[PDB]
Design a protein around this ligand. Structure first.
Ligand SMILES: Cc1ncc(COP(=O)(O)O)c(CN[C@@H](CCC(=O)O)C(=O)O)c1O
Ligand SMILES: Cc1ncc(COP(=O)(O)O)c(CN[C@@H](CCC(=O)O)C(=O)O)c1O
Lengths: 388, 388
């Protein structure tokens, strides 16, 4: 039963870090998994307009049609994904809902779900809650943390039914290239898996990197649940609005699940997001945010490396994952030390899976000045403790 | 797995009704279970203020402390329930989320959950999804659909673990008396059950009915999950905001589940609700809504009985459940006929459980003028078909 599965889910290491950091002052948090920017004003204005228009009643379990149509257009233009807004697109209370609900549309007892690690903290627990068995597939820093099909093939079994992909990736910041996705797609097809693609950080890509969606690849829509949302893209984390595009049979089961869960997303919020998707100001805001994230990203990448922590330059999202194993400390002890002496909160790499052990996650979704200060604090401790 | 459980949950008779009635012209809908009133303007203003305050980021999984504190005050004053806002009160994306997540805090494989019927449609499916077995316990017209403990006694087994009660009740409008609850409390303690009490319609009570909360009774807090929310009370259905008060051990498990579900409720919406709870104008609006609901209630009760359908006068919520079995038609056939010929959509009582068969649910949460017309149309068809 669900209660048994919930008991199998381990307590959060990020939760533990927060509880401790909170009880201390002068601490700079680098464990934030959300934008620091406020929601663009014009979007706030669209929400106010929706409130004046009286859009405060229930909407379809699947989401407002107007929003689904706006999402279909965004998917087509930006991602090359063709999805019918009437049956293949569902709005959710944040993109986070997609994993538990999406997997519940097909996952059977004991079936395995390949989860490339380091991985976002929601994946494994969602698999366990759905009734399956999570199977971690390590990614390596020498591969810029890009998932390698060589690794997937070693961990796949006859019990494997799904694969969860995340690009741009949280916590590594890795971006899967088109060739990477083509190879993953072939593997997915070969093993008759359903692949869930988490693309919420799609717009925060840097350097020469481009965002490709696996569902846009030849014959992939029939076996892909594309997950995205407005939380990162429009700095709307507190608005709780995400969405998925998938075959209608999966969508039908997801709305059925929703009928006994959150029912439907916030009506006036959906109206604002539909208007936001078609407003040039929304995208100009996305560009400004990406620019600032990039400025902070170059700061932390250079500082981490120069202070003695080999760090892969992230190509997407707003996270960076420095190697800390050479200091002789475990990810947890490294985080404990930084919180106590540097007054800087970083997430132990192990929180993202075994492959994350030996690393630590730092989020640069915070003021540049705060980042400069946290870098100095961290470097001070590393050098004083002779860890570098 | 969840997918198998989901496959076991039967398709919704309500959506089937809504699908058909969707394309039909001139249909007066009496099957919508939500306030027709718009959200009070002052509450809309608090949300706009929250947007101006930049409350658009993540909030705690358990909800905004300010809102939890406001809820603790409301629960104490209005319900006599003493709950610690820091550990025993959780804010949700609508009260609907409480059943699946609340049950998942303890329900084991095959454990039975007593569900007095006619009952709200989310109960049985939530039990099934959680991994248990829903057991319907009939309530009767002669008892004004108030649950009788002697009936519960017929269904108890060694496997019984919980009971879900709803007062005021949807679809019957039944309100459990203080003595009903005292008797139910005894049975719950006797069998070491956890009782979930859905009190979302508490403010819409009429005649000599009064709202008691089972959790407020002697030693009941330790085994009760009180469910409530703002959807009905403040006409905030599209805002998706509800809550529960329960022992911390239950709350911890519900917050853990939320981490892999919707994460947290809408931040600016929670702020608006916290302020709304302490605003005198909110209760003024509630009273205004209750009086209007009462006006509509007397109209539909008079009309239904006088047209030939024996109907218990409801004492709470905004639903009325006329007896249709004497027409010789089933609930579904009666509903079909009304939609086809009267162009009025009513929900077949069977959608609320086996004990709902022979009845039909009507929602009077719609313009008084629309109700009059719907009553006339229904009466005309009953008379033409000599069903009455
Ligand atoms: C990779 C990824 N997928 C989904 C989500 C959920 O975002 P939603 O749209 O707001 O529900 C996340 C986001 N964020 C945090 C975890 C949740 C939180 O409230 O902090 C994180 O990155 O750890 C990510 O990353
Ligand atoms: C008895 C009862 N409990 C909970 C809810 C859910 O309210 P929310 O999640 O706070 O908005 C309800 C409400 N409503 C409907 C079902 C869903 C819909 O959109 O109509 C019903 O009455 O059938 C009730 O009734």
């Amino acid at each position: 039963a669900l209660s048994d599965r919930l008991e199998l889910v381990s307590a959060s290491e990020i939760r533990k870090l927060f509880d401790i950091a909170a009880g201390m002052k002068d601490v700079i948090s680098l464990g934030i998994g959300e934008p620091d920017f406020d929601t663009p004003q014009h979007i706030k204005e669209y929400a106010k307009e929706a409130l004046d228009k009286g859009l405060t009643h229930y909407g379809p379990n699947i989401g407002l049609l107007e929003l689904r149509e706006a999402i279909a257009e965004k998917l087509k233009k930006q991602n090359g994904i063709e999805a019918d807004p009437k049956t293949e697109i569902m709005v959710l209370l944040g993109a986070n809902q997609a994993f538990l609900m999406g997997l519940s549309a097909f996952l059977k007892d004991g079936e395995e779900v390949l989860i490339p690690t380091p991985a976002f903290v929601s994946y494994a627990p969602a698999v366990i809650l759905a009734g399956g068995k999570p199977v971690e597939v390590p990614t390596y820093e020498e591969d810029e943390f890009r998932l390698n099909v060589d690794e997937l093939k070693k961990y796949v079994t006859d019990k494997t039914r799904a694969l969860i992909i995340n690009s741009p990736c949280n916590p590594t910041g890795a971006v899967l290239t088109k060739k990477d996705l083509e190879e993953i797609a072939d593997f997915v097809v070969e093993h008759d898996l359903i692949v869930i693609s988490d693309e919420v950080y799609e717009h925060f890509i840097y350097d020469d990197a481009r965002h490709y969606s696996i569902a846009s690849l030849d014959g992939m829509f029939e076996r892909t649940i594309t997950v995205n949302g407005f939380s990162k893209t429009f700095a709307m984390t507190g608005w709780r609005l995400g969405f998925v595009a998938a075959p209608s049979w999966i969508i039908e089961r997801m709305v059925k699940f929703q009928m006994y869960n959150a029912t439907c997303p916030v009506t006036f919020i959906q109206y604002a997001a539909a208007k936001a998707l078609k407003d040039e100001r929304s995208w100009k805001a996305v560009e400004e945010m990406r620019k600032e994230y990039d400025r902070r990203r170059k700061l932390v990448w250079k500082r981490l490396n120069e202070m003695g922590l080999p760090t892969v330059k992230p190509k997407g999202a707003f996270y960076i994952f420095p190697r800390i194993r050479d200091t002789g400390l475990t990810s947890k002890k490294f985080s404990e030390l930084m919180l106590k002496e540097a007054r800087v909160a970083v997430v132990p790499g192990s929180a993202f899976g075994k492959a994350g052990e030996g690393y630590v996650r730092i989020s640069y979704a915070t003021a540049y000045e705060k980042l400069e200060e946290a870098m100095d604090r961290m470097e001070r401790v590393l050098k004083e403790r002779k860890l570098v």
